[PDB]
Amino acid sequence: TQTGNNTTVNIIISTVDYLLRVQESISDFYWYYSGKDIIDEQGQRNFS
Amino acid sequence: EIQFLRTDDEVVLQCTATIHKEQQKLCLAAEGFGNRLCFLESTSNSKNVPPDLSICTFVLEQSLSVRALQEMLGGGHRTLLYGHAILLRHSYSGMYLCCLSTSRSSTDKLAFDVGLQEDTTGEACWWTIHPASKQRSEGEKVRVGDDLILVSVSSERYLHLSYGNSSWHVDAAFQQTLWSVAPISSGSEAAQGYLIGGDVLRLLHGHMDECLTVPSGEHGEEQRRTVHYEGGAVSVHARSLWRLETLRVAWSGSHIRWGQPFRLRHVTTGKYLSLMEDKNLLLMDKEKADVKSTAFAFRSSKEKLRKEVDGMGTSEIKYGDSICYIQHVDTGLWLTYQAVDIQRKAIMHHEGHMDDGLNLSRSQHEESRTARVIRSTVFLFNRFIRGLD
Amino acid sequence: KGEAIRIRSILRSLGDLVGVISIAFQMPTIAKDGKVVEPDMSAGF
Amino acid sequence: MKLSQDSSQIELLKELMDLQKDMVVMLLSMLEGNVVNGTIGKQMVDMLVESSNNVEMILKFFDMFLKLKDLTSSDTFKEYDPDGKGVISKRDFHKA
Amino acid sequence: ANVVVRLLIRRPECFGPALRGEGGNGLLAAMEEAIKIAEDPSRDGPSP
DSSP B206-254: SSS-EEEE---GGGTTT-TT--EEEESHHHHTTSSEEEEEESSSTTTTS
- Shortest CA distance to B161 belongs to which of B44, B35, B51? B44
Question: If contacts are CB pairs under 8 Å, which of residues 12-71 in chain D contact chain A?
Answer: 12, 15
Nearest residue to B53 via CA among B96, B6, B90: B90
Please check whether residue D52 touches B, CB under 8 A.
yes
- DSSP code of D4? H
Are the CB atoms for B44 and B222 separated by under 8 Å? no
The secondary element (H helix, E strand) that includes residue B374 is: helix B365-388
Task: Estimate to the nearest angstrom the gap between the alpha carbon of B204 and the chain centroid.
Answer: 23
Residue of B nearest to D54 (CA): B75
Neighbouring chains of A at 3+ CB pairs under 8 Å are B, D
Q: Which chains touch E (3 or more CB pairs under 8 A)?
A: B, C
Strand duo B346-349 + B179-181: pairing = unpaired
* Nearest C-alpha in D relative to B77: D50
Do E and D make contact via 3 or more CB pairs under 8 A? The reply is no
> C13 vs B109: CB contact, 8 Å cut-off?
no
User: What b/e readout covers B70-83, taking b as 16+ CB neighbours within 10 angstroms?
Assistant: eeeeeeeebebbbe
Distance (Å, whole) CA B376 – CA B379:
5
Q: Residue B302 corresponds to which amino acid? A: K
**From the centroid of its chain, how far is CA D95?**
23
Radius of gyration of chain B (CA): 23
Q: Min CA distance, A31 vs chain D (Å)?
A: 13
Cβ separation of B67 and A31 shorter than 8 Å? yes
**Centroid of chain to Cα C14:** 16
Give contacts of B79 with chain D, Cβ < 8 Å: 50
Of D87, D89, D96, D91, nearest in space to D66 by CA: D96
**Cβ distance of E9 and B107 shorter than 8 Å:** no
Contact B264, B296 (CB under 8 A): yes
The answer to whether D15 contacts A47, with C-beta atoms less than 8 Å apart, is yes
B-chain CB neighbours of D53 within 8 Å are 75
With CA atoms as reference, report the closest residue to E31 among C23, C12, C18.
C23
Q: Whole-angstrom Cα distance, residue B277 to residue B330?
A: 12
Q: Which of A27, A31, A47, A48 would best serve as a mutation to test chain D binding (most D beta carbons within 10 A)?
A: A47
Distance from first CA to last CA of chain C, Å, rounded? 40
Resolution in A: 3.5
**Residue D19: CB atoms within 10 Å:** 11
In the chain, the amino acid numbered B94 is G
Q: How many residues does this entry show for chain D?
A: 96
Q: After which residues does chain B show a gap where C to N exceeds 2.5 Å?
A: 73, 305, 341
- Contact criterion met (CB < 8 Å) for B67 and A20: no
Q: Strand locations in chain E, DSSP E? A: none
Question: Cβ contact (<8 Å) for A44 and D12?
Answer: yes
Q: Is the separation of the CB atoms in B273 and B265 below 8 Å?
A: yes
Contact B209, B234 (CB under 8 A): no
Total residues belonging to chain E:
48
Q: Please report which helix (H) or strand (E) contains residue B89, including its range.
A: strand B85-90
Q: How far is CA B294 from the centre of its chain?
A: 17
**CA–CA gap between residue A24 and residue D47 (Å, rounded):** 17
DSSP code, position B81 = B
Cα distance from B317 to chain C (closest Cα, Å)? 53
Q: Are B116 and B92 in contact (CB under 8 A)?
A: no
Q: Are B118 and B94 contacting, i.e. CB atoms less than 8 angstroms apart? A: yes
Helix, strand, or coil here: A42?
A: helix
Q: Are B243 and B200 in contact (CB under 8 A)?
A: yes
Q: What are the CA-CA distances from residue D23 to residues B48, B194, D1, D3, D30 (Å)?
A: 60, 46, 18, 19, 11
Contact B177, B149 (CB under 8 A): yes
Judge: E28–C16 Cβ closer than 8 Å, yes or no. yes
Between chain B and chain D, the number of residue pairs with CB atoms below 8 A apart is 3
Cβ contact B14:B25 at 8 Å: yes
Give C5→chain E minimum CA distance, Å.
Answer: 12
Instruction: Specify the amino acid at residue D63.
Output: D
Q: Are strands B96-98 and B38-41 parallel, antiparallel or unpaired?
A: unpaired
| Cβ(B338)–Cβ(B184) below 8 Å | no
* Rg of the Cα atoms in chain D: 19
CB A48 within 8 A of CB D12: yes
Secondary structure (3-state) at B201? strand
Helix (H, G, I), strand (E, B) or coil at A17: helix
Q: Name which of B214, B272, B204, B273 is nearest B239 in CA terms.
A: B214
Under DSSP, is residue A6 helix (H, G, I), strand (E, B) or coil?
Answer: coil
Residue E41 Cα, gap to closest chain C Cα (Å): 9
Which residues of chain E from 1 to 48 reach within 8 Å of chain B, CB to CB?
Answer: 6, 9-12, 19, 21-23, 26
Contact A39 D12 (CB under 8 A): yes
Eight-state DSSP code of residue B142: P
Q: Which amino acid is at B325?
A: Y
Number of H helices, E strands in chain E: 2, 0
Q: Which distant-in-sequence residues (6+ apart) come within 8 Å of B67 by Cβ?
A: A28, A31, A32
- Residues B190, B271: Cα–Cα separation, whole Å: 29
Q: Which of chain B's residues have a Cβ under 8 Å away from the Cβ of C13?
A: 103, 110, 112
B154 touches chain E (CB under 8 A): no
CA atoms of C16 and A40, how far apart (whole Å):
48
- Compute the distance between CA of residue E20 and CA of residue E23 in angstroms, rounded to an integer: 8
- Residue B67, amino acid: R
End-to-end CA distance of chain B: 56
* Cα angle for residues B323, B329, B334 (degrees, 5° grid): 50
**B177 contacts B158 by C-beta, under 8 angstroms:** yes
E28 to chain C, minimum CA–CA distance in Å? 7
- Is the CB of B67 less than 8 angstroms away from the CB of A24? no
Chain B residue nearest residue C12, CA to CA: B110
Burial environment of residue A48 by CB neighbours within 10 A (0 to 12, 13 to 18, 19 or more): exposed
Q: Does D39 touch chain B (CB under 8 A)?
A: no
Is the CB of residue C3 less than 8 Å from the CB of residue B153?
A: no
Query: Would you call D11 an interface residue with chain A, using a CB distance cutoff of 8 Å?
Result: yes
